[PDB]
Amino acid sequence: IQKAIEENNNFIKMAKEKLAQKMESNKENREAHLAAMLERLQEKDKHAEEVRKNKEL
Amino acid sequence: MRECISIHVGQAGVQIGNACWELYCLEHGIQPDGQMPSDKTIGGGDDSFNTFFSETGAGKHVPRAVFVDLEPTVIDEVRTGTYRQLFHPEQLITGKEDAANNYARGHYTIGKEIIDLVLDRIRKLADQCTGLQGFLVFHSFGGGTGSGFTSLLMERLSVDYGKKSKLEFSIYPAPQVSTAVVEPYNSILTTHTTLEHSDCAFMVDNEAIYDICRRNLDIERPTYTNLNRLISQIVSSITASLRFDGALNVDLTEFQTNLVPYPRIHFPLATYAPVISAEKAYHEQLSVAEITNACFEPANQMVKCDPRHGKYMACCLLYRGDVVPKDVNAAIATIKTKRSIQFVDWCPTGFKVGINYQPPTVVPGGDLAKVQRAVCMLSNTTAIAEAWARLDHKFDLMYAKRAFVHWYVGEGMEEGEFSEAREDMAALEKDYEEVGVDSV
Amino acid sequence: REIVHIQAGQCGNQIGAKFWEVISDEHGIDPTGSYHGDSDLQLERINVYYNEGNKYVPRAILVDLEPGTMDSVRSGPFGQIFRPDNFVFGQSGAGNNWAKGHYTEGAELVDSVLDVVRKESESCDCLQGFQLTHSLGGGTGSGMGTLLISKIREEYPDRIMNTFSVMPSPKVSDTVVEPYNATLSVHQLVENTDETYCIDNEALYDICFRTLKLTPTYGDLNHLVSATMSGVTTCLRFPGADLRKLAVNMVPFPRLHFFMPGFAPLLTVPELTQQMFDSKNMMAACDPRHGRYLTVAAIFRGRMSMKEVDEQMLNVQNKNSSYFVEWIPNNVKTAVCDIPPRGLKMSATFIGNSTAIQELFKRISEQFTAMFRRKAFLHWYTGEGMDEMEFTEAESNMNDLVSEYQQYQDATAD
Ligand SMILES: Nc1nc2c(ncn2[C@@H]2O[C@H](COP(=O)(O)OP(=O)(O)OP(=O)(O)O)[C@@H](O)[C@H]2O)c(=O)[nH]1
Ligand SMILES: CCC[C@@H](NC(=O)[C@]1(C)CSC(/C(C)=N/O)=N1)c1cc(OCC2CC2)cc(=O)o1
Ligand SMILES: Nc1nc2c(ncn2[C@@H]2O[C@H](COP(=O)(O)OP(=O)(O)O)[C@@H](O)[C@H]2O)c(=O)[nH]1
Ligand SMILES: [Ca+2]
Ligand SMILES: [Mg+2]
Ligand SMILES: [Mg+2]
């Protein structure tokens, strides 16, 4: 009976853990993808300010 | 005691939940306002129908159910539908933005915003149970909510309720009425993730339910209302042993013992008969032998496959209505001599029989004729793996070119999850091959 | 589920104006904003494009660096139904110069445009995304249009962005530097839009001249565009899928999101279907039988046997299987709307993500390299602060886009 208890608690434990890793790796990946997008749009603004500065020259 | 909690996820799960609960109410004499005149014990009771219905002091019989969707348009129809007074508002949970047929959005981006609320509402229903038996989860494989959020929920239920039984009713995609080209992706992903958290899953091929409505009910282009009223009959036949009493009544859990030889081999093939229009049922009463013979006609299966080219590991017959054992044993004897029922060599060849004497009911205004007797056959056959092979082949075609995969990666998923899920399905296809080979 | 509409440039505002006239009529809206329709289906999805004294105001934003085109909108039909605060115009103009629209005369005004976007979006219960009407041959629609898309994507990174882009054709050339404005704006659309519907003027001109037999004004070309745009948005505007769900199923690869529209008639379901798939009914100057379809979406309008539509769409696929890639199963989706258009008992609109669209980019690239090979008219751009690399980059990016369409046209299942 204690072996049955142990296996149920270990199944609950592993499930809770595997799910926790999934929801963290996904949070990190999505934040990174969205950071790269906003970073590229920052280089467009940097390139645009350099275009307007090259004109007045 | 022995209560069951139903969870309906996404459009398909919700709209099928509507058909089932409407049908349950008709079977138990429960009015749209929740009143049940025949119920003399007010406020509670341990009747068979109390496994699915709780009772209030005002005499209202409330389903032990939860409807969940990431957008509100489908559940709003339940809020303003014929059975609006049947459900407490807290049993109807809705978000604002759907999953867009994206598993990743249903499991992560959007689903993680409502999962805690859903679990809290499921907990409130479980606290009303004196001896909770398990859950019934209705969902599609193809939708982003049906696939993604269902996988997340099943994972969370395993944590919060241990190995308490969880049964699935899953809508297997049919290209025809499908609006998702990425449906194979969502199907493989959800099957892989839920496989270790589900004890028994009943797949329903929309294409099979579609053909049965065109052929047997003479409906040119069936709608979801047509499909769902037929699906509800199958669900009713399967759950009738939990909601009704009877001497010859065999509990679903007892069938489950025979249907699941290994944890991963838990996908029974369902077959239902009779499906007959009123015009044809008039002056033609189908006997026990006729509806039993129809169970072994592949045209009546819920999933497109050929059991005649596979092997059986179990055969269960769930009769309901005017049926006695004498007729059943006579009909089975005939079929045992006229059909190719080949069993694996490590399982006995007997047919397990159950009989519920409450006759079947039909939704008024529907296309299904009211019959005196009906039967649902639950068989565990290797042939159901054909449904995996068709879906895995479509997966492979698109994934070889990484078609549409950027939508999943953009939400935070990795390609490793795709390959990992596809390999699990490959092992499952192999598992169904291994169980069919003869012993040494 | 609200959509925010934006009109930019001369073309963008005239196409957008026609669009609102068509859908306003379909929803029973009069030029003053009142509802006088006979069907409740006209109001079930009215909030998608309109806000609510028991009136309906388009959720639209009109933009242009010159008041000429926009002033004609206020006076024209349905001109008063628009919200006056949503008119945002300058004075100096763009001079059909992409640089002026994307960097100079456009960057100064872009901020005041965003302010109107924020106000409209904050009144949305659940904003789906945006749609833009503009041309790629001008200066405001192309230069400032692409700029505004990049700026909207910063504040609304998780909202779908669609564009109805009018492509330049020598048969209706208003200028000679159009191959520059198109190649520069295409360089942008490849990065910051989820779906782009290529409205090719060459196709509209050939439809008006050959088919309709008009030996053609911008009003004739736009009568096609208004019918195309009405059919495309049908599933959104009448009951019976949000922008993201649509984009998820139509865009197998992020860069390949440029579609060929089609409309019919320009009558039975077989005839209607065959005409809709004919190269003569394409709103883009591309022959689909010179490439392969990655995805297709079709909408049928009118009282017609749905069982017949299902069989006719399965028939065309089977008999034309060679023009649909085998590695995307079930890549043709179809809908039926019981409400017909105006003046037609039954019509059909279709959008296709076909590899044959490279023909459109091959034409714009040839007109570009023909001028860039000699540095013609480059002072209109370098004078605004550009360099030559930015021109070559846009050329290389659009050339790579053609190579990718060819990669998947050649791909095989085995
Ligand atoms: N049998 C049946 N199938 C349905 C029904 N509704 C949708 N489906 C199927 O479900 C699949 C699409 O998933 P849906 O359930 O509609 O989508 P969802 O679960 O709400 O998830 P998202 O909408 O993407 O957020 C397709 O294969 C449909 O054919 C229904 O009422 N009955
Ligand atoms: C010719 C039909 C075009 C229409 N598509 C449909 O009407 C159906 C049939 C409904 S379902 C569906 C899909 C993709 N299912 O998977 N295609 C459509 C509309 C649309 O709005 C764009 C906004 C700017 C205006 C985007 C799109 O991509 O397709
Ligand atoms: N179909 C159509 N195309 C137009 C219309 N007006 C301009 N165009 C095209 O758009 C290009 C010029 O861009 P335009 O929008 O007029 O310049 P802008 O005022 O700076 O935005 C040319 O190639 C024209 O062929 C119109 O009313 N209908
Ligand atoms: Ca009672
Ligand atoms: Mg949904
Ligand atoms: Mg102009």
XYZ file of N, CA and C in Angstrom, chain B residues 92-227:
408
model
N -20.338 28.511 -16.434
C -20.124 28.923 -17.819
C -18.998 29.951 -17.833
N -17.802 29.506 -18.211
C -16.588 30.312 -18.165
C -16.196 30.670 -19.590
N -15.876 31.944 -19.816
C -15.503 32.420 -21.140
C -14.373 33.432 -21.037
N -13.476 33.396 -22.016
C -12.507 34.448 -22.228
C -13.014 35.449 -23.244
N -12.076 36.172 -23.853
C -12.403 37.172 -24.860
C -11.798 36.898 -26.228
N -10.667 36.198 -26.300
C -9.973 35.946 -27.556
C -9.656 34.460 -27.658
N -10.054 33.843 -28.767
C -9.907 32.406 -28.927
C -8.450 32.045 -29.223
N -8.214 30.762 -29.491
C -6.874 30.247 -29.736
C -6.492 30.256 -31.208
N -7.412 30.625 -32.100
C -7.114 30.783 -33.525
C -6.571 29.489 -34.132
N -7.166 28.358 -33.745
C -6.722 27.043 -34.208
C -5.231 26.835 -33.958
N -4.723 27.394 -32.863
C -3.311 27.297 -32.505
C -3.214 26.616 -31.146
N -2.715 25.376 -31.142
C -2.516 24.645 -29.893
C -1.731 25.473 -28.882
N -0.684 26.165 -29.337
C 0.167 26.921 -28.423
C -0.624 27.999 -27.694
N -1.565 28.643 -28.387
C -2.355 29.690 -27.749
C -3.303 29.105 -26.712
N -3.868 27.929 -26.987
C -4.779 27.319 -26.037
C -4.080 26.737 -24.826
N -2.867 26.219 -25.008
C -2.130 25.613 -23.905
C -1.306 26.621 -23.111
N -0.797 27.671 -23.759
C 0.101 28.607 -23.094
C -0.470 30.020 -23.081
N -0.308 30.738 -24.195
C -0.535 32.181 -24.227
C -1.871 32.566 -23.602
N -2.966 32.043 -24.142
C -4.290 32.424 -23.664
C -4.766 31.509 -22.542
N -4.486 30.210 -22.641
C -5.040 29.270 -21.681
C -4.560 29.505 -20.263
N -3.304 29.928 -20.105
C -2.754 30.131 -18.770
C -3.401 31.302 -18.039
N -4.218 32.103 -18.723
C -4.912 33.221 -18.097
C -6.230 32.821 -17.448
N -6.756 31.639 -17.760
C -8.083 31.248 -17.305
C -8.030 29.892 -16.610
N -6.896 29.197 -16.720
C -6.799 27.843 -16.174
C -7.068 27.846 -14.674
N -6.516 28.825 -13.954
C -6.728 28.878 -12.509
C -8.202 29.081 -12.181
N -8.885 29.942 -12.936
C -10.313 30.132 -12.717
C -11.086 28.852 -13.006
N -10.740 28.157 -14.091
C -11.446 26.927 -14.437
C -11.292 25.897 -13.325
N -10.065 25.722 -12.826
C -9.833 24.750 -11.763
C -10.601 25.118 -10.500
N -10.650 26.409 -10.165
C -11.404 26.828 -8.990
C -12.877 26.460 -9.125
N -13.439 26.600 -10.326
C -14.846 26.264 -10.518
C -15.060 24.754 -10.505
N -14.108 23.989 -11.044
C -14.198 22.536 -10.951
C -14.109 22.094 -9.496
N -13.295 22.788 -8.699
C -13.151 22.429 -7.290
C -14.468 22.602 -6.542
N -15.217 23.661 -6.854
C -16.485 23.896 -6.169
C -17.472 22.764 -6.430
N -17.496 22.239 -7.658
C -18.384 21.120 -7.953
C -17.937 19.859 -7.224
N -16.626 19.606 -7.188
C -16.122 18.410 -6.521
C -16.402 18.429 -5.022
N -16.420 19.614 -4.404
C -16.722 19.711 -2.978
C -18.163 19.323 -2.664
N -19.062 19.393 -3.645
C -20.437 18.946 -3.467
C -20.589 17.433 -3.581
N -19.520 16.710 -3.904
C -19.585 15.275 -4.146
C -19.220 14.513 -2.880
N -20.024 13.502 -2.548
C -19.720 12.627 -1.425
C -18.698 11.556 -1.786
N -18.556 11.239 -3.071
C -17.593 10.257 -3.522
C -17.300 10.404 -4.999
N -16.584 11.466 -5.356
C -16.317 11.760 -6.757
C -15.642 10.575 -7.437
N -16.181 10.181 -8.590
C -15.674 9.031 -9.329
C -14.668 9.428 -10.403
N -14.942 10.490 -11.152
C -14.027 10.910 -12.192
C -14.644 11.996 -13.048
N -13.930 12.328 -14.121
C -14.299 13.415 -15.010
C -14.598 12.886 -16.405
N -15.458 13.616 -17.122
C -15.733 13.393 -18.535
C -15.413 14.676 -19.287
N -14.450 14.612 -20.204
C -13.933 15.788 -20.892
C -14.313 15.693 -22.362
N -15.084 16.671 -22.839
C -15.537 16.734 -24.224
C -14.786 17.841 -24.954
N -14.165 17.498 -26.079
C -13.353 18.465 -26.798
C -13.104 17.965 -28.209
N -12.634 18.875 -29.050
C -12.163 18.545 -30.383
C -10.648 18.365 -30.358
N -10.146 17.580 -31.311
C -8.709 17.494 -31.534
C -8.189 18.691 -32.326
N -9.043 19.306 -33.145
C -8.608 20.277 -34.131
C -8.536 21.714 -33.663
N -9.441 22.110 -32.774
C -9.456 23.475 -32.301
C -8.265 23.795 -31.418
N -7.929 25.084 -31.366
C -6.848 25.519 -30.496
C -7.203 25.395 -29.029
N -8.472 25.634 -28.687
C -8.929 25.434 -27.319
C -9.185 23.958 -27.041
N -9.860 23.274 -27.966
C -10.124 21.861 -27.774
C -8.858 21.051 -27.573
N -7.794 21.400 -28.296
C -6.534 20.672 -28.206
C -5.608 21.256 -27.141
N -5.334 22.560 -27.219
C -4.326 23.151 -26.352
C -4.784 23.280 -24.912
N -5.943 23.910 -24.699
C -6.429 24.095 -23.337
C -6.822 22.772 -22.685
N -7.351 21.820 -23.462
C -7.701 20.519 -22.896
C -6.466 19.799 -22.363
N -5.358 19.848 -23.109
C -4.123 19.234 -22.638
C -3.656 19.871 -21.336
N -3.698 21.205 -21.263
C -3.320 21.900 -20.037
C -4.230 21.503 -18.885
N -5.538 21.451 -19.136
C -6.479 21.085 -18.086
C -6.237 19.658 -17.607
N -6.068 18.721 -18.543
C -5.848 17.330 -18.161
C -4.592 17.191 -17.312
N -3.521 17.891 -17.687
C -2.309 17.887 -16.875
C -2.593 18.412 -15.476
N -3.335 19.520 -15.384
C -3.628 20.107 -14.082
C -4.555 19.228 -13.256
N -5.477 18.508 -13.899
C -6.378 17.643 -13.148
C -5.630 16.455 -12.553
N -4.664 15.904 -13.289
C -3.848 14.825 -12.742
C -3.144 15.265 -11.465
N -2.730 16.530 -11.405
C -2.032 17.036 -10.226
C -3.004 17.227 -9.070
N -4.155 17.841 -9.340
C -5.103 18.190 -8.290
C -6.012 17.040 -7.879
N -6.047 15.939 -8.639
C -6.953 14.844 -8.312
C -6.300 13.475 -8.480
N -4.973 13.399 -8.434
C -4.307 12.110 -8.491
C -4.705 11.321 -9.720
N -4.800 10.001 -9.549
C -5.186 9.096 -10.622
C -6.699 8.911 -10.717
N -7.478 9.846 -10.173
C -8.922 9.819 -10.361
C -9.247 9.748 -11.848
N -10.204 8.892 -12.196
C -10.420 8.551 -13.595
C -10.800 9.781 -14.412
N -10.259 9.852 -15.625
C -10.577 10.909 -16.576
C -10.853 10.262 -17.925
N -12.072 10.440 -18.425
C -12.495 9.913 -19.714
C -12.669 11.053 -20.709
N -12.258 10.817 -21.950
C -12.368 11.798 -23.017
C -13.425 11.376 -24.028
N -14.172 12.359 -24.527
C -14.931 12.242 -25.768
C -14.315 13.243 -26.733
N -13.590 12.737 -27.725
C -12.757 13.548 -28.601
C -13.304 13.521 -30.019
N -13.421 14.700 -30.625
C -13.911 14.831 -31.992
C -12.711 14.771 -32.928
N -12.610 13.673 -33.662
C -11.537 13.442 -34.620
C -11.839 14.206 -35.903
N -10.866 14.921 -36.468
C -11.189 15.887 -37.521
C -11.586 15.225 -38.829
N -12.587 15.818 -39.478
C -12.975 15.466 -40.834
C -12.678 16.642 -41.750
N -11.786 16.503 -42.739
C -11.446 17.648 -43.592
C -12.641 18.470 -44.068
N -13.778 17.814 -44.304
C -14.929 18.455 -44.931
C -15.380 19.695 -44.169
N -15.901 19.508 -42.956
C -16.451 20.609 -42.174
C -15.356 21.279 -41.351
N -14.101 20.936 -41.628
C -12.985 21.506 -40.890
C -12.615 22.873 -41.448
N -12.292 23.799 -40.545
C -11.846 25.135 -40.913
C -10.374 25.359 -40.592
N -9.647 24.308 -40.217
C -8.259 24.420 -39.788
C -7.390 23.516 -40.648
N -6.461 24.122 -41.393
C -5.475 23.348 -42.131
C -4.420 22.772 -41.195
N -4.250 23.364 -40.012
C -3.226 22.944 -39.066
C -3.810 21.911 -38.109
N -5.009 21.427 -38.410
C -5.654 20.448 -37.543
C -4.777 19.239 -37.241
N -4.048 18.661 -38.196
C -3.139 17.560 -37.838
C -2.143 17.938 -36.756
N -1.552 19.134 -36.831
C -0.609 19.554 -35.797
C -1.261 19.535 -34.421
N -2.431 20.163 -34.293
C -3.085 20.230 -32.993
C -3.489 18.850 -32.496
N -3.830 17.938 -33.411
C -4.255 16.600 -33.011
C -3.095 15.810 -32.421
N -1.964 15.764 -33.128
C -0.805 15.023 -32.638
C -0.319 15.610 -31.321
N -0.306 16.942 -31.215
C 0.211 17.576 -30.007
C -0.650 17.247 -28.794
N -1.976 17.301 -28.940
C -2.839 17.077 -27.784
C -2.892 15.600 -27.411
N -2.877 14.712 -28.406
C -2.870 13.286 -28.107
C -1.617 12.901 -27.333
N -0.459 13.410 -27.758
C 0.784 13.115 -27.054
C 0.747 13.617 -25.616
N 0.235 14.829 -25.401
C 0.293 15.432 -24.076
C -0.715 14.815 -23.114
N -1.886 14.416 -23.608
C -2.925 13.852 -22.756
C -2.813 12.345 -22.591
N -1.987 11.677 -23.400
C -1.966 10.216 -23.416
C -1.748 9.632 -22.024
N -0.815 10.196 -21.254
C -0.519 9.676 -19.926
C -1.499 10.159 -18.867
N -2.381 11.099 -19.201
C -3.338 11.631 -18.245
C -4.761 11.146 -18.486
N -5.004 10.387 -19.548
C -6.333 9.885 -19.863
C -6.375 8.381 -19.641
N -7.435 7.913 -18.989
C -7.618 6.489 -18.740
C -8.401 5.797 -19.843
N -9.270 6.528 -20.539
C -10.081 5.964 -21.610
C -10.604 7.117 -22.454
N -10.433 7.017 -23.768
C -10.819 8.077 -24.690
C -11.661 7.486 -25.811
N -12.847 8.054 -26.014
C -13.753 7.651 -27.085
C -13.633 8.659 -28.221
N -13.007 8.246 -29.321
C -12.863 9.116 -30.479
C -14.117 9.061 -31.344
N -14.487 10.210 -31.901
C -15.657 10.338 -32.764
C -15.197 11.021 -34.044
N -15.131 10.259 -35.132
C -14.743 10.786 -36.434
C -15.931 11.530 -37.035
N -15.778 12.845 -37.224
C -16.852 13.640 -37.810
C -17.269 13.091 -39.170
N -16.310 12.581 -39.944
C -16.636 12.028 -41.252
C -17.516 10.791 -41.129
N -17.303 9.980 -40.087
C -18.168 8.824 -39.862
C -19.562 9.254 -39.422
N -19.646 10.225 -38.506
C -20.946 10.739 -38.091
C -21.619 11.476 -39.243
N -20.827 12.080 -40.130
C -21.374 12.764 -41.294
C -22.023 11.772 -42.253
N -21.328 10.671 -42.546
C -21.858 9.690 -43.487
C -23.109 9.014 -42.940
N -23.152 8.771 -41.627
C -24.316 8.111 -41.042
C -25.551 8.997 -41.153
N -25.383 10.318 -41.061
C -26.524 11.214 -41.194
C -26.977 11.343 -42.645
N -26.038 11.296 -43.594
C -26.409 11.353 -45.004
C -27.070 10.056 -45.457
N -26.561 8.914 -44.989
C -27.018 7.622 -45.485
C -28.278 7.153 -44.765
N -28.294 7.241 -43.437
C -29.359 6.636 -42.646
C -30.507 7.589 -42.349
N -30.248 8.894 -42.288
C -31.284 9.876 -42.005
C -31.663 10.710 -43.222
N -31.008 10.497 -44.363
C -31.341 11.181 -45.613
C -31.248 12.699 -45.454
N -30.159 13.149 -44.843
C -29.855 14.568 -44.711
C -28.800 14.905 -45.753
N -29.121 15.842 -46.647
C -28.219 16.152 -47.751
C -26.883 16.678 -47.240
N -26.913 17.733 -46.424
C -25.702 18.310 -45.839
C -25.922 18.497 -44.342
N -25.590 17.491 -43.532
C -25.837 17.599 -42.090
C -25.115 18.786 -41.475
N -25.713 19.329 -40.421
C -25.117 20.402 -39.645
C -24.526 19.835 -38.357
N -23.886 20.709 -37.578
C -23.394 20.302 -36.268
C -24.546 19.860 -35.371
N -25.695 20.530 -35.476
C -26.870 20.090 -34.733
C -27.247 18.664 -35.106
N -27.116 18.311 -36.388
C -27.374 16.936 -36.801
C -26.341 15.987 -36.208
N -25.058 16.353 -36.287
C -24.014 15.487 -35.752
C -24.125 15.354 -34.238
